[PDB]
Design a protein around this nucleic acid. Structure first.
Ligand code: HPA
Ligand code: HPA
Lengths: 338, 338
DNA sequence: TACGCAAACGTTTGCGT
DNA sequence: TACGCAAACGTTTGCGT
């Protein structure tokens, strides 16, 4: 079709190309004429053809876990912002923690020749670490590990442990000594990693969480609902609970209410993520905030780097969680004794 | 590179192609050998090259408004599911109701030659209707109008009006006659459209909503918070409020609580959307559910149709809202008198 | 029988003049 | 000075034999 444009304009396609990409000087007249045709002809250059020669699609692939989940969604929306402004196109792919699903998206992606790959799989079994390696050729960063699982990729680390610790600390400093915890999947960083930061502060304080007091969640409200239930549904109950994620917490809130327990007056709750609308949780949720925007921008950036400045060596950038005091936590019985 | 594969296998690339696409019979031996090379060589066919000949990228573009918003997110995740299973690749593009932003994504998309276009712009000014037309050549459906704004596209209609009506009705039948409303942007279907369905039921019941009682929202929790405030913050207040969207409602809940108002005991609240976690709103939110999954699947479908069976004529499919009784609504003063 | 040739898809770009 | 030629990018596919 560039051919048809060149014709209407009575010049070479080479010319046409030059004016379309301002890649060499072109007579005003000439340049106008090209536009002229470009317009009537209603021309849309073909990126596929272009990509064929220039060797880069100017498109990036997001190999995600899921996109509805608030936490996730927020990150994604950030990443997209970044692609858009640096001219990239985003191909969002959700694998739902399915190996087969992952092996697929991974493949479709390579085939569509994505300039780079953004990775958010939540859990990384050897089998997954494996496939990922088979693509070391395509530039990629994983945005959700705690340490650097591998050498063939970039990594942004969230400091999910110091997050866990921050949370426990607060509760402790608040007068609490009978605390429960509903963590997320231990096969995930935000899961095991947050739990352990929390657990260290406890040990540090000689606090011992009864096993009847720690209940796995899956980051979904329902899991929170069930955990809280189980927790307050026992003879002896804690005065405070640390909830691995905001959405689950939101679920933990509803159950207390349903059992007629007042929060923070009956149980104090601290969550984690500081999701876009935790402030409007009822009560306004006190939580650890995870910089998600920076998590995205910073991920897009290492990638762009690797891409544009052809970087070869892996790299890793830390990011930092920070406590956000809201209204779901009250003083514990030991406040005054410290 | 297919060339390098053909070589390792000592056969023509044509052969290689045939076995890669099972497009004509190939000797077992032969076929194995090809795979053999395909493997050591570590071959990934190029979709871009392929697309160059076959004329279709097997990729679809989602020209959305934003993706963090629950409502939105849910729809999107559905659409992606559908693309994935019918082999399509999703390019998610957020225009934030920005014309310039839209003119851009639209263009990048055409250029990347997307097989079809999914449209979710929220608001459609003539200027937007205009650009969209310039692309009548690319198959597309808009998933968010109430009626069929144009002839060059497919349309799935949500019946947002009968939704509005359902909501009012309930409130009426519940004993309520002093109702307030916090609608969403009137420049959107889910906004004006839901409001009017609501307003008709009122008129039908000879109920008159005082203007001091209707406050615009923007679908975001904060806007809900402010509206509720303004509403209950007056001398005379309603006993029930219809909230244009769940997330705003969630915001409307927090403010009542903050003003020490009990819900549903002091004010009853009915929302709209039936978002994934309204059940865990505190109280479990009574709302009108919008089939979002079907909204997506049904959108992907008309498109695929247009695509594959080269359909030319516009088409439109209705979908239906339905009331979900939860715990945020209580009997009104007139229940018994009916 | 089972396969190979060569043109074509829509652009970019090294040389020329 | 300001532009045009022709090869090349990686596959698909109509004909042949
Ligand atoms: O893996 C996760 N899923 C959902 N929400 C989350 N918040 C932190 N980690 C997660
Ligand atoms: O335009 C909208 N935005 C956000 N949530 C919504 N729910 C219905 N319509 C909308």
């Amino acid at each position: 079709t560039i051919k048809d444009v060149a014709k209407r304009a009575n010049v070479s396609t080479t010319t046409v190309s030059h004016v379309i990409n301002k890649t060499r000087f072109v007579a005003e007249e000439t340049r106008n004429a090209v536009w002229a045709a470009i317009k009537e002809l209603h021309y849309s250059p073909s990126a596929v053809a272009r990509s064929m020669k220039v060797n880069h699609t100017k498109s990036i692939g997001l190999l995600a876990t899921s996109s509805e989940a608030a936490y996730f969604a927020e990150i994604i929306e950030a990443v997209e912002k970044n692609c858009f402004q640096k001219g990239y196109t985003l191909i969002l792919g959700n694998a739902w923690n399915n190996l087969e699903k992952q092996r697929a998206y991974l493949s479709m992606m390579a085939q569509k020749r994505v300039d780079g790959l953004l990775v958010m799989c939540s859990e990384y079994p050897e089998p997954l670490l494996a496939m990922l390696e088979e693509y070391r050729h395509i530039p990629m960063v994983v945005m959700d590990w705690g340490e650097a699982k591998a050498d063939f990729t970039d990594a942004v680390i969230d400091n999910a442990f110091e997050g866990g610790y921050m949370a426990g600390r607060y509760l402790i400093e608040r007068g609490h000594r009978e605390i429960g915890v509903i963590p997320g999947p231990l096969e995930r960083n935000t899961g095991a990693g947050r739990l352990a930061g929390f657990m260290k502060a406890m040990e540090e304080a000689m606090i011992k969480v009864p096993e009847s007091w720690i209940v796995q969640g899956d980051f979904e409200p329902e899991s929170g609902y069930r955990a809280m239930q189980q927790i307050l549904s026992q003879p002896h109950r804690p005065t405070a609970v640390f909830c691995g994620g905001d959405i689950m917490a939101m679920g933990a809130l509803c159950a207390a209410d349903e059992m007629g327990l007042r929060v923070p007056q009956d149980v104090s709750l601290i969550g984690y993520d500081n999701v876009r609308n935790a402030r409007y949780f009822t009560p306004a949720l006190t939580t650890i905030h995870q910089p998600k925007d920076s998590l995205g921008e910073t991920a897009f950036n290492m990638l762009l780097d690797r891409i544009v400045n052809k970087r070869e060596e892996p790299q890793s950038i830390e990011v930092h969680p920070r406590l956000i005091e809201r209204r779901s936590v009250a003083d514990g019985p030991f406040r005054d004794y410290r």
